[PDB]
Ligand binder design. Structure first.
Ligand SMILES: [Mg+2]
Lengths: 301, 99, 49
DNA sequence: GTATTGACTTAAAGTCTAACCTATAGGATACTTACAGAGGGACACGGCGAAT
RNA sequence: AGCGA
DNA sequence: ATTCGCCGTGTCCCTCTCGCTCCTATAGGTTAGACTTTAAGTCAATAC
């Protein structure tokens, strides 16, 4: 047998309960609405309300539990509608079961927000609610990257237009062609193509691509020691100059803590004015541009 | 300057498939004109290497311990006999035997 | 003259590109890569000690 | 050389408005069961027969 | 996927 | 019919190395974009 198919097991499961008709649906809807109002009234009467008479409390609690019963009965009734609807979409989505469950969520929404006084079979409203929920969940859970609904819709419209034009014309149209067809810009079309891209799988057969994936962002393995020696040389050169000049440069360019101190802060910490320090900075940088202080640093670019 | 760095610094010569222990041996490198590794003819037996176009891999020990290991244990002149039967594999063969 | 010319074979690496998921050196002369010091070579080294 | 004041331009924020993405809800005729479309050694789950 | 030892 | 001893069949992990070349409607968040302010950097002259 090898009965490990949850699909067939679930179908066999949902085949147990019988399908219903319009008057039965009206009865169930009335029962659920009455049960909900009963629970609401009992909560209201439990808080600063009234000591519910034993018999009244009893039969209204019965009404509540029976409303829940009817809700569940209806959901069991229309599971088959869910599967029948879900069949069309499968082929471009996830596990069938996921779509079925989204359909069930749409059903509980529909049975929550159904009205019987309009005198209609429940099937249509159920259908629309189901489809809305399925499409929403499919979109939210389609790709490893998330693409919100309106952009999903324009992507689908672009795809349908391109496919029908391929069927009719026979050639793949152009970005300007799709821009004029969809009343949008060619750059927008290009962006929709770009965001339409789906990730490739690191796992493949060729071997796996993961083998040949150079780590362009990684240890350079030479610039590390290069920067170490660089810093050593800068400390040396700064020691060659005056200590005040060296400290001023270190604070100006953040060589001591990584925090770049500016003219007002350095003038404050040296007890002088920012123009004084600007003169200091200009003279020191002019001193540094003199090649004897720069022959040992020129090669570091 | 390359000569000076090279002097007294052994390298390892792997040949796949490394059937047995002498597939890897440590040699003192010396610089040679051209682009082909010049291998001493008398380790051909150990490497099972005829010169019909076979290729070898040069590794490079770095730490002092690795250099000592290559120098003392895996040097060519220190691995003459077989590990199997103790017969010499540096034994002259083929053309030298004919001579 | 056969098409197995030295210029198309000689290869070396001191430090070059690296793999992604595993941090091993890459492979192939198209890249730099290094030589796979494989399991039998490991055995040779252990036998030497 | 070292430390100042008074324009004169400049980058870095701060803010106001805004404008443009983005997440969420709903859509009320009827609409009721997925799909399918090597070989070898070894062990464990199970045929065939004598005994009580 | 193709190829050399 | 259960026990114990045989056979028999079905389902599963493992086998050289190295290289090369569908739509609508709301409400809220985000950023963006430009106008305005301010600390900031510069230049010219100067006195000691
Ligand atoms: Mg050969």
């Amino acid at each position: 047998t090898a009965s490990a198919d949850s699909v067939r097991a679930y179908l066999k499961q949902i085949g147990k309960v019988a399908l219903l008709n319009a008057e039965e649906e009206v009865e169930l809807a009335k029962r659920i609405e009455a049960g909900l109002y009963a629970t609401q009234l009992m909560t209201e009467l439990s808080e600063r309300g009234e000591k519910l008479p034993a018999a009244q409390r009893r039969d209204m609690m019965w009404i509540c539990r029976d409303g829940d019963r009817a809700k569940n009965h209806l959901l069991e009734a229309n599971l088959r509608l869910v599967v029948s609807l879900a069949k069309r979409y499968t082929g471009r989505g996830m596990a069938f079961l996921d779509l079925i469950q989204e359909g069930n969520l749409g059903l509980i929404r529909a049975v929550e927000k159904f009205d019987y006084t309009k005198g209609y079979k429940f099937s249509t409203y159920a259908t629309w609610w189901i489809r809305q929920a399925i499409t929403r969940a499919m979109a939210d859970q389609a790709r490893t990257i998330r693409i919100p609904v309106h952009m999903v819709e324009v992507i689908n419209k672009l795809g349908r237009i391109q496919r029908e034009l391929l069927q009719d014309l026979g050639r793949e149209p152009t970005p300007e062609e799709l821009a004029k067809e969809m009343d949008i810009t060619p750059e927008k079309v290009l962006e929709i193509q770009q965001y339409a891209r789906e990730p490739i799988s690191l796992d493949q057969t060729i071997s796996q691509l993961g083998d040949f994936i150079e780590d362009s962002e990684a240890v350079v393995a030479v610039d590390a020691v290069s920067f170490t020696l660089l810093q050593d040389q800068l400390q040396s050169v700064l020691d060659t100059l005056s200590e005040r000049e060296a400290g001023v440069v270190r604070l100006r360019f953040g060589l001591t803590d990584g925090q770049p101190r500016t003219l007002d802060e350095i003038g404050q910490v040296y007890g002088v004015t920012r123009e004084r320090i600007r003169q200091i900075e200009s003279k020191t940088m002019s001193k540094l541009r003199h090649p004897s202080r720069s022959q040992v640093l020129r090669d570091y670019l | 300057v390359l000569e000076e760095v090279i002097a007294e610094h052994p390298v390892l010569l792997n040949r796949a498939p490394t059937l047995h222990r002498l597939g890897i041996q440590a040699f003192e490198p010396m610089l040679v004109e051209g682009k082909a590794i010049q291998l001493h003819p008398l380790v051909c037996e150990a490497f099972n290497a005829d010169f019909d176009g076979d290729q070898m891999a040069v590794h490079l020990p770095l730490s002092a311990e690795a250099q000592a290991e290559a120098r003392i244990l895996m040097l060519s002149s220190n691995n003459i006999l077989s590990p199997a039967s103790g017969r010499p594999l540096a034994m002259p063969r083929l053309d030298m035997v004919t001579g | 003259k056969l098409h197995h010319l030295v210029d198309d074979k000689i290869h070396a690496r001191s430090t070059g590109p690296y793999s992604m998921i595993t941090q091993q050196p890459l492979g192939g002369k198209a890249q730099f890569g290094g030589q796979r010091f494989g399991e039998m070579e490991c055995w040779a080294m252990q036998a030497y000690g």
